[PDB]
Design a protein around this motif. Structure first.
Motif, short mmCIF file in Angstrom:
data_model
loop_
_atom_site.label_atom_id
_atom_site.label_comp_id
_atom_site.label_asym_id
_atom_site.label_seq_id
_atom_site.Cartn_x
_atom_site.Cartn_y
_atom_site.Cartn_z
N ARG A 1 0.86 -1.18 0.00
CA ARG A 1 0.00 0.00 0.00
C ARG A 1 0.90 1.23 0.00
O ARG A 1 1.52 1.55 1.03
N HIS A 2 0.94 1.92 -1.13
CA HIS A 2 1.79 3.10 -1.29
C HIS A 2 1.22 3.98 -2.39
O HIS A 2 0.71 3.46 -3.40
N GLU A 3 1.30 5.31 -2.18
CA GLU A 3 0.76 6.28 -3.13
C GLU A 3 1.35 6.09 -4.53
O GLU A 3 0.69 6.37 -5.55
N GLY B 1 -2.64 0.50 -7.00
CA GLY B 1 -3.39 -0.04 -5.87
C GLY B 1 -4.09 -1.36 -6.20
O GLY B 1 -4.96 -1.41 -7.08
N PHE B 2 -3.77 -2.41 -5.45
CA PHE B 2 -4.39 -3.72 -5.63
C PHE B 2 -5.82 -3.72 -5.09
O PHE B 2 -6.10 -3.20 -4.00
N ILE B 3 -6.72 -4.35 -5.84
CA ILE B 3 -8.07 -4.63 -5.37
C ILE B 3 -8.33 -6.14 -5.22
O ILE B 3 -8.75 -6.60 -4.16
N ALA B 4 -8.06 -6.92 -6.27
CA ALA B 4 -8.34 -8.36 -6.21
C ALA B 4 -7.61 -9.13 -7.30
O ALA B 4 -7.27 -8.60 -8.36
N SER B 5 -7.40 -10.42 -7.00
CA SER B 5 -7.01 -11.42 -7.99
C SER B 5 -8.11 -12.47 -8.03
O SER B 5 -8.55 -12.95 -6.99
N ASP B 6 -8.54 -12.83 -9.24
CA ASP B 6 -9.65 -13.75 -9.44
C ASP B 6 -9.23 -14.85 -10.40
O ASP B 6 -8.68 -14.57 -11.47
N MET B 7 -9.52 -16.09 -10.03
CA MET B 7 -9.41 -17.23 -10.92
C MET B 7 -10.80 -17.85 -11.03
O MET B 7 -11.38 -18.24 -10.01
N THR B 8 -11.30 -17.99 -12.25
CA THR B 8 -12.63 -18.53 -12.49
C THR B 8 -12.51 -19.73 -13.41
O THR B 8 -11.87 -19.65 -14.47
N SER B 9 -13.10 -20.85 -12.98
CA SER B 9 -13.13 -22.06 -13.77
C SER B 9 -14.07 -21.87 -14.96
O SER B 9 -15.19 -21.38 -14.82
N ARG B 10 -13.60 -22.25 -16.14
CA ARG B 10 -14.41 -22.32 -17.34
C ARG B 10 -14.42 -23.76 -17.82
O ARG B 10 -13.67 -24.60 -17.31
N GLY C 1 -0.71 14.69 -10.45
CA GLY C 1 0.60 14.95 -11.01
C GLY C 1 1.68 13.97 -10.60
O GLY C 1 2.79 14.02 -11.15
N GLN C 2 1.40 13.09 -9.65
CA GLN C 2 2.31 12.01 -9.33
C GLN C 2 2.01 10.79 -10.19
O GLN C 2 0.97 10.70 -10.85
N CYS C 3 2.92 9.83 -10.15
CA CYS C 3 2.79 8.58 -10.89
C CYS C 3 2.73 7.42 -9.93
O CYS C 3 3.05 7.55 -8.76
N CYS C 4 2.37 6.25 -10.45
CA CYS C 4 2.50 5.02 -9.68
C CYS C 4 3.02 3.91 -10.58
O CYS C 4 2.72 3.85 -11.78
N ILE C 5 3.79 3.05 -9.99
CA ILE C 5 4.42 1.93 -10.68
C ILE C 5 3.45 0.76 -10.70
O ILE C 5 2.85 0.44 -9.67
N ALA C 6 3.36 0.11 -11.85
CA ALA C 6 2.45 -1.00 -12.10
C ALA C 6 3.21 -2.23 -12.60
O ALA C 6 4.34 -2.14 -13.11
N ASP C 7 2.53 -3.37 -12.51
CA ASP C 7 2.92 -4.65 -13.11
C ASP C 7 4.05 -5.34 -12.35
O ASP C 7 5.23 -5.15 -12.64
N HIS D 1 10.33 2.39 -2.25
CA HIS D 1 9.46 1.62 -1.37
C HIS D 1 9.53 0.14 -1.71
O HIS D 1 9.62 -0.72 -0.82
N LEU D 2 9.52 -0.19 -3.00
CA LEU D 2 9.66 -1.59 -3.38
C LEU D 2 10.98 -2.17 -2.87
O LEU D 2 11.01 -3.24 -2.24
N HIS D 3 12.08 -1.45 -3.12
CA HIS D 3 13.42 -1.97 -2.86
C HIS D 3 13.73 -2.18 -1.37
O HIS D 3 14.55 -3.03 -1.04
N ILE D 4 13.14 -1.40 -0.48
CA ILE D 4 13.62 -1.32 0.90
C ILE D 4 12.88 -2.33 1.78
O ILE D 4 11.64 -2.32 1.85
N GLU D 5 13.63 -3.20 2.45
CA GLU D 5 13.05 -4.08 3.46
C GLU D 5 12.63 -3.30 4.69
O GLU D 5 13.38 -2.46 5.21
N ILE D 6 11.43 -3.58 5.19
CA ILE D 6 10.92 -2.94 6.40
C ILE D 6 10.64 -4.04 7.41
O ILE D 6 9.89 -4.98 7.12
#
Ligand SMILES: COc1cc(-c2cncc(-c3ccc(C4CCNCC4)cc3)c2C)cc(OC)c1OC
Ligand SMILES: COc1cc(-c2cncc(-c3ccc(C4CCNCC4)cc3)c2C)cc(OC)c1OC
Ligand SMILES: COc1cc(-c2cncc(-c3ccc(C4CCNCC4)cc3)c2C)cc(OC)c1OC
Length: 286
Positions: free
Chosen positions: A57-59, A63-72, A147-153, A117-122
């Protein structure tokens, strides 16, 4: 109680080898839905495993909401659901927007903030392992209305407690000397790619009435869809780096950013600046 899971898919905003990304709606709010190709199922599993380990969770992280796997009947459908950024990726935005000093620095500092934020262990209870992204590029950064950005993927991300896009690969990846046993090596690959993104953004900052057109890194020395060998020749054998235009040296901000870029592009990975040092340097510009 009712669990409302329906998502209305409204417009396809991206399509590629990975599948598609759709603007969708859930309970009246926009969301982004990435529908994975069969070819790219591993990226769903990697991002899902990461978020199941640490709920980032970082500006400056998408921002993650969900991961979904659906059987077809004969297949498995995989969706990643995130917040939606209507201005699109940094790649898209820079095509027809130019920047001023404040907006340029705000973009690049926000990227450095997400990357640090990604790189640093907390440590402790609200902590996280260190994470390397491994596919940083302007198409994997989204622009926010503030005007800020966010990193994805995070489909290629690695944690410490598909390969990357060839155009953005660091020399040690292209020449296969990367120390695959050292987590810091992956951080340093991210820093190389950050330097290229910084170059892409800086070209679009106006100074003295001059601006460069949007171009991807190495546009003048490799083809579209460059091969691994094409990149190795440029980056490793000839040790070329993106050009810094003369006009940048009339502007104090671009002069400082050129120095920063150069310190992300050393052939020796351990000589490159860290994300935290980049953040500090950016806060002292202007
Ligand atoms: C299963 O699938 C999906 C569920 C939801 C969803 C919908 N409404 C309510 C919820 C909910 C959330 C939390 C709690 C708890 C938490 C512990 N104690 C108190 C209450 C209950 C319910 C959730 C998860 C949404 C999906 O998409 C957007 C979705 O599909 C991916
Ligand atoms: C997955 O995404 C979303 C889920 C919801 C949602 C739906 N129902 C219940 C919840 C919930 C309620 C209570 C608690 C707890 C957990 C600790 N102890 C006490 C409090 C957790 C969760 C939530 C978050 C809403 C979203 O937006 C508005 C949403 O984003 C699209
Ligand atoms: C890079 O990775 C991801 C990005 C997103 C994402 C989030 N918000 C907005 C977008 C977007 C919206 C619109 C446009 C434009 C571009 C030209 N004009 C028309 C439309 C571009 C991009 C996108 C792609 C979502 C992901 O997953 C769910 C995702 O994967 C993790």
């Amino acid at each position: 109680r009712t669990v409302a899971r329906d998502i209305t898919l409204l417009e396809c905003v991206g399509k590629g080898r990975y599948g598609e990304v759709w603007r969708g709606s859930w309970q009246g709010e926009n969301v982004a839905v990435k529908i994975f190709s069969s070819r790219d199922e591993k990226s769903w599993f990697r991002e899902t495993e990461l978020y199941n380990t640490v709920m980032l969770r970082h500006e400056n992280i998408l921002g993650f909401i969900a991961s979904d796997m659906t059987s077809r009947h004969s297949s498995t459908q995989l969706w990643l659901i995130t917040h939606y950024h209507e201005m699109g990726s940094l790649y898209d935005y820079l095509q027809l927007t130019t920047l001023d000093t404040v907006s340029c620095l705000r973009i690049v500092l926000s990227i450095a903030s997400g990357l640090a934020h990604l790189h640093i262990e907390i440590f402790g209870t609200q902590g996280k392992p260190a994470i390397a992204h491994r596919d940083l590029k302007s198409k994997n950064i989204l622009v926010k209305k503030n005007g800020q950005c966010c990193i994805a993927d995070l489909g290629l991300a690695v944690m410490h407690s598909r390969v990357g896009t060839k155009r953005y690969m660091a020399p040690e990846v292209l020449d296969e000397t990367i120390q695959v046993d050292c987590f810091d090596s992956y951080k340093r690959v991210d820093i190389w790619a950050f330097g290229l993104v910084l170059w892409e953004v800086a070209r679009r900052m106006v100074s003295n009435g001059i601006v460069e057109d949007y171009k991807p890194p190495f546009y003048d020395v490799v083809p579209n869809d460059p091969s691994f060998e094409d990149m190795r020749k440029v980056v490793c054998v000839d040790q070329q780096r993106p050009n810094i235009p003369n006009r940048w040296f009339s502007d104090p901000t671009l002069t400082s950013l050129a120095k920063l870029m150069k310190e992300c592009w050393y052939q020796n990975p351990s000589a490159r600046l860290t994300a935290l040092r980049i953040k500090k340097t950016l806060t002292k510009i202007d």
